[PDB]
Amino acid sequence: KQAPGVSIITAEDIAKRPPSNDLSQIIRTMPGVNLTGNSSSGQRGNNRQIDIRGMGPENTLILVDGKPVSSRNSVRYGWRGERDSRGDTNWVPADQVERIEVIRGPAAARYGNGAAGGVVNIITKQAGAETHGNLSVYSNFPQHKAEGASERMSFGLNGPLTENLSYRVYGNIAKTDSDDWDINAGHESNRTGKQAGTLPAGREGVRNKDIDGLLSWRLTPEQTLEFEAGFSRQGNIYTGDTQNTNSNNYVKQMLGHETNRMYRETYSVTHRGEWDFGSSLAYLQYEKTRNSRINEGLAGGTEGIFDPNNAGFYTATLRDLTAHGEVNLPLHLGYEQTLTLGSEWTEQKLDDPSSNTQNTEEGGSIPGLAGKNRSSSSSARIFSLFAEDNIELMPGTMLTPGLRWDHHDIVGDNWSPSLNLSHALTERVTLKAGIARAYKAPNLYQLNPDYLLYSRGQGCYGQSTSCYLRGNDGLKAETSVNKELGIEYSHDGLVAGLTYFRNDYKNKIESGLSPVDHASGGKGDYANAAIYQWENVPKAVVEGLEGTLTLPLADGLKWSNNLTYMLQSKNKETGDVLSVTPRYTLNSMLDWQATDDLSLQATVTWYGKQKPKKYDYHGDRVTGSANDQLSPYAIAGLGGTYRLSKNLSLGAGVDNLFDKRLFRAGNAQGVVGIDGAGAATYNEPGRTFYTSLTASF
Ligand SMILES: O=C(NCCCC[C@H](NC(=O)c1cccc(O)c1O)C(=O)O)c1cccc(O)c1O
Ligand SMILES: [Fe+3]
């Protein structure tokens, strides 16, 4: 389950720590993984996503059965590096997942674009020889009614239909109620003037509907051909959340209603082949995401709040097209060694009506950018060639070099080399080392000179005058030299390991610091505003430790722990933090096999201190409640599963036994009328009982 750099979560694990709804809840308990925003603003702070080794969630590549999910790239990427997106770990329902693979650092660079943190690969249950299926129910029950309860019903059904033909289908309906609109009342940062009365919001609710079908068809002895289609829809339940925590009437009007809907449709064809030389695999995926949501503004404190002037839904469309080919070749060349070879092609088409609408009437106009009817379209294509040799040098020892080459049609050519070593020092001890250069192609918002944000001053680096931020097709890719050195003892279910990791992070893309130009014209003291672009930042660094310890106390009884310790996270230009994480995270399970039929699980997570950013959007040092830190705290849980037969199991437990609760107070920093909240940017739910039922053949 744990080795240096890599973790498997199994279906059995998912059952013993059932997630409310999204998988992030269990994925985040692996070593090296946090659940965090993408930068440090605190904006959209209850919408946290999986972060690997502090590299941010935009650098965590999500796969389903080896096939990329890109849906969140259909939500506007904002000034501060957040999208109002819940992420892409909630498309597959927990109970139909066979296993989840988390691959961190140098071992994941070979996956290419957006794996600079790592890869999470969510794998679904598949058909067997004979026909199986299940029906799964989960339902939880908050102690405090403000917080939103969750409900989940999913089914699976799999089997053969001819001797070489098989099917698997599954289907889910889920609800996670939102937190009440007022849950953070009494905990909010201090609000005066125009912003008096405003609230930072609790967790958004989400309604899920997921339906997948697969036909897998075995044309020859050594040939298999799979066709699959997926239909999912998440519609939220809105509870007041806005980028800056400000409000208007339209906001309040929408409390309790759907304000975003994400429809995700996937079709895929996959051929896997099994012959003398070795092994082929190739596929086509078409992912189409419709992001339909209420029009929002794009300027200043109006960035990311419903626009009352321009009311109604707009719809962003992401068409993502992916095709992949790989063959594997054993080579008996003195050295026993296996050799992978592969191309990849992807296209991202984005249609976005709202995001490019910000006009130039106030800050003055911008040579090269029309103030109106600018294009809705952007796109990018990456072509990719890659090869990996996995060498055996002696029994116990593998050396694994590979080279990935990527051609981005705008950004140019990228070379991501890698090397991974693992070394039996003893039958019980293994040393691992890895050093790779991973790749991040700018997203379509960063890249687009037609994408334009505006502020009167409040949000402008190094000044109080009006300014524009503009996309920049001159950008370089972000690269990162991810190093890791680790050691692990493993013998008779005793496991003890510690890994050190450092990622040197080059050309991290962020809103710029210096004006490149000044517009001309516009209104009053806001006229002739400064123009910044999205800029590559020369150097940043993350550093820390991953640990694991597993002791089998007796036969019936297993004690597990995973440790993250974050040593550093530094934008080396400005000196501020990249993400905000806990100083450490320790997850502890005790697993008692109380009878052949009963199993019992006690868990604790300890979170270290959390510190907010030091500098505001001006580059100036923050003061008062914008410095507020979160103290360390722990969350404990008991749960169990009582198997009534081969066909029927029941679960029950309590998450957060001792009711430790936290409340979003706002964003990190102060604006006019809204005192900052520092690191108190998210809501931690209180005690929550839950029950579950799984019927299966
Ligand atoms: O939250 C912010 N400011 C306090 C909320 C002001 C909301 C609202 N703002 C505007 O209408 C506005 C319009 C155009 C340009 C701006 O910079 C604005 O703040 C208002 O005027 O009351 C804020 C955050 C980042 C950047 C900014 O320029 C902000 O005003
Ligand atoms: Fe403003």
Residue numbers in the entry: 25 to 721
According to the publication:
In Gram-negative bacteria, Fe3+-siderophore complexes are recognised at the bacterial cell surface by highly selective outer-membrane TonB-dependent transporters (TBDTs). These transporters bind the Fe3+-siderophore complex and translocate it into the periplasm. The structures of pyoverdine, pyochelin, citrate and ferrichrome iron complexes bound to their respective transporters FpvA, FptA, FecA and FhuA showed that the ferric-siderophore complexes were bound inside the barrel adjacent to the plug domain, a position thought to be poised for translocation. Pseudomonas aeruginosa, a serious opportunistic pathogen, does not make enterobactin but does possess a TBTD outer-membrane protein PfeA, related to FepA, that binds and translocates Fe3+-enterobactin into the periplasm. PfeA has the same two domains (22-stranded β-barrel and N-terminal plug) common to the TBDTs.
Azotochelin and protochelin are two siderophores produced by Azotobacter vinelandii, an environmental Gram-negative bacterium. Fe3+-enterobactin, Fe3+-azotochelin and Fe3+-protochelin coelute with PfeA on a size-exclusion column suggesting each of them are bound by PfeA. Crystal structures show that these two molecules bind in the same location as enterobactin (with less than 0.5 Å shift between the relative position of the iron atoms) and two of the catecholate rings occupy the same positions as rings II and III of enterobactin. Hydrogen bonds between the catecholates and Ser479, Gly325 and Arg480 are conserved. In the azotochelin complex, a molecule of ethylene glycol from the crystallisation solution completes the coordination shell of the iron, and this molecule interacts with Gln482. The stacking interaction between Arg480 and catecholate II has been conserved. However, the side chain of Gln482 is unable to form a hydrogen bond with the aliphatic backbone of azotochelin, and is slightly displaced. The carboxylate group of the backbone is pointing towards the surface of the protein in the vicinity of Arg480 and Lys218. The positioning of the three rings is clearly important in making the optimum interactions with the protein, indicating there are constraints on the linkage geometry. It is, however, worth noting that the connection of the rings tolerates the addition of at least one extra carbon, seen with protochelin and that a molecule with only two rings (azotochelin) can be efficiently bound.
